[PDB]
Amino acid sequence: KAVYNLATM
Amino acid sequence: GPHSLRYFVTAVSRPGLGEPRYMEVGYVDDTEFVRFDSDAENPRYEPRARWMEQEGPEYWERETQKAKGNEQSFRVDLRTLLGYYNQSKGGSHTIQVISGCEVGSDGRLLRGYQQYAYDGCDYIALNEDLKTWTAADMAALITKHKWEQAGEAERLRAYLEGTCVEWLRRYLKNGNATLLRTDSPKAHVTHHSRPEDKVTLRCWALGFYPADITLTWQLNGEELIQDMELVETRPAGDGTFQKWASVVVPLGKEQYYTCHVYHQGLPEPLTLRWEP
Amino acid sequence: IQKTPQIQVYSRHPPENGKPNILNCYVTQFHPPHIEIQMLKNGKKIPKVEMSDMSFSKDWSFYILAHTEFTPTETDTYACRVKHDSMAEPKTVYWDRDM
């Protein structure tokens, strides 16, 4: 909960 | 005023020299408050601001994990773009992400965003409706199709509409005394010789926050934006900014040019001409 | 793409001999990100140097900040030398109190 859970391209 | 939470995350391969450099920097309004750097001794999300010490152990471990996860994700991302762009394994490439949300003074969502770029150029970015994606080129068009299929966009809107605005709110309060302050600029003008009986007048503005400011040189009721020369506002290494703008005037008639400084801490703009 | 660093060297406050200050070397609008930034005093390298304020622009070029505490002296010369892939040789920018 602060930064984003980044996706794979 | 409005505010915003801002992530600047970078991945960058270094073939022959191991796993990539992955970094993450986080900003609430021109104030660096968080950092991750896979080149640290002990790579762990660390505070960059006293008001972020407040947070307990749990926070720092969660951020440090979802960071380590993102790092892994961009390792994959980096190989994938190699194939997409038919590039060879032997070169060094960069991915870049800008992610966050701004809000208004009522604390409500004003705008969210997440942008990706590869080797400098735009790749793909979430549009303002928080639903669609705009692809830069056909390579990033594959990624797009993947993410429509995986409801990544509505998943990101949960993060943006929710996690992001609610912690910006958190941060603005935890650190109201720092983030919500207003340092007014202090200003002066410097004089410099020049061949051809010309003269350079630089107007400095220092020790101010927030970063937003405007300097203009005038002459009898009209600004000279064109024949000016400024430097992007800059960090002064202590959470304040400074900017300078110069103008070339003819010797003897510098008395007639005036400088103007506009900022949050300036109820009334500043006006200064020169210290003969 | 390659883009050249803009190296600006500047004190937090107007310089005054014997009074404490921060020395700044803002290195901007550069790409790729691999970059080497050394602050120098009297041609020597300064050890206690903090990096901060890393960011990008819509442009996507990199912006990073080196700074260190320092105490001005009339004779003491300060500088910033940066190595990047867009540069023939390492470019060194001297600090100019008068500017």
Which experimental approach was used here? X-ray
- CATH code, B234: 2.60.40.10
Is B187 in the same domain as B89?
A: no
Q: What resolution in angstroms, rounded to 1 decimal? A: 3.0
- CATH code, C34: 2.60.40.10
Give SS3 for C74.
Answer: coil
Cα R_g (chain B), whole angstroms:
23
Q: Which of B181, B215, B234 is the last residue of a domain?
A: B181
C32 prior amide bond cis, ω within 30: yes
Is B257 in the same domain as B207?
A: yes
The Cα–Cα gap between C10 and B233 comes to: 12
User: β-strands C62-70, C50-56: how paired?
Assistant: antiparallel
The Cα–Cα gap between B272 and B247 comes to: 14
Give SS3 for A3.
Answer: coil
Q: In one letter, which amino acid is C19?
A: K
B47 prior amide bond cis, ω within 30: no
- Domain assignment of residue C46, given as a range: 1-99
Token output for C98: 């008068």
**Contacting subunits of B (3+ beta carbon pairs below 8 A):** A, C
Strand partners, B219: B257
Cβ neighbour number for residue B128 with a 10 Å cutoff:
10
Q: Is B156 an 8 Å CB contact of chain A?
A: yes
Cα R_g (chain A), whole angstroms:
8
Is B121 in the same domain as B132?
A: yes
- Domain assignment of residue B124, given as a range: 1-181
Mutate to test the interface with B, among A1, A6, A8 (most CBs of B within 10 A): A6
Is B170 in the same domain as B203?
A: no
Contact B77 A2 (CB under 8 A): no
Total number of domains in chain C: 1
Is B186 in the same domain as B258?
A: yes
User: Which of B141, B23, B144 lies closest to B74, judged by CA?
Assistant: B23
